[PDB]
């Protein structure tokens, strides 16, 4: 995250970290939606142009963390992967549409004050909250600038942007399955998700039930915290039929 600030303990209990076994490296972020299902970006697990293509084996998910680094002794929980599920129609060559993947934990995690799950929106909340101007929460352990990493999980609140503006900032073929957020040039407030952030969540808090809903997945962009530019996120709502298909197919 660029232009954001230090999270607060237990402020993002569904914040999950996708970790590399060896080389032991952090590769992305993701969120917890049940005690055995984790959501992330497909490109976190499979992105050819990088010769990326991991298996439920090369990886580990670390749950309940604050430090980017310390082993948080009674506080974190290390988990193994059962199956990884990439969207049958996730396009990496062209626009990164349907940048989404589910991962089933070999074992269900035990909720705590630092571990608990975010909610996925229903039709109605999507219309309510997904409106140009409304703000979102994007948390990550990603870069502190386009071109380091924080000591602690970072948070930045940003507003959804209007379709046409999104389309006007980039040459990429923006689809119905993504959304854009960050400030406009004329608004003089910044912040954006940067590298090490995809998979991580874009959440909003309903004024109706006071629950956090996951409205997007940190996906992609041109640069980071660039005037005239917008962070792009996967439309969680939009791709729910599939999340739901694979879930009550392969777990729960």
């Amino acid at each position: 995250i660029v232009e954001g600030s230090d999270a607060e303990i237990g402020m993002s209990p569904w914040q999950v970290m996708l970790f590399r076994k060896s080389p032991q490296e952090l590769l992305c972020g993701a969120s917890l939606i049940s005690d055995r299902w984790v959501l992330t970006a497909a490109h976190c697990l499979l992105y050819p142009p990088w010769d990326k293509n991991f298996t439920e084996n090369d990886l580990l998910v670390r749950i309940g963390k604050h430090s980017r680094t310390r082993y948080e002794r009674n506080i974190e929980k290390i988990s193994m992967l059962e199956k990884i599920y990439i969207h049958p129609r996730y396009n990496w060559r062209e626009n990164l549409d349907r940048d989404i993947a589910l991962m089933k934990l070999k074992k269900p995690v035990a909720f705590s004050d630092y571990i608990h799950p975010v909610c996925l929106p229903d039709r109605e909340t999507a219309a309510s909250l997904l409106q140009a101007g409304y703000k979102g929460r994007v948390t990550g352990w990603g870069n502190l600038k386009e071109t380091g990493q924080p000591s602690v999980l970072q948070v930045v609140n940003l507003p959804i942007v209007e379709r046409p503006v999104c389309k006007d900032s980039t040459r990429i073929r923006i689809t119905d399955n993504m959304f854009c957020a960050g400030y406009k040039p004329d608004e003089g407030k910044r912040g954006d998700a940067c590298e090490g952030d995809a998979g991580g969540p874009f959440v909003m808090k309903s004024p109706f039930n006071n629950r956090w809903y996951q409205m997007g997945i940190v996906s992609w962009g041109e640069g980071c915290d660039r005037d005239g530019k917008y962070g792009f996120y996967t439309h969680v709502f939009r791709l729910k039929k599939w999340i739901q298909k694979v879930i009550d197919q392969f777990g729960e």
């Binding site: 990496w92 940067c194 952030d197 992609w220 041109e222």
Partner: peptide
Amino acid sequence: DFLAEGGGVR
């Protein structure tokens, strides 16, 4: 081309 048009996966 995400890459070609400058695409920055994160």
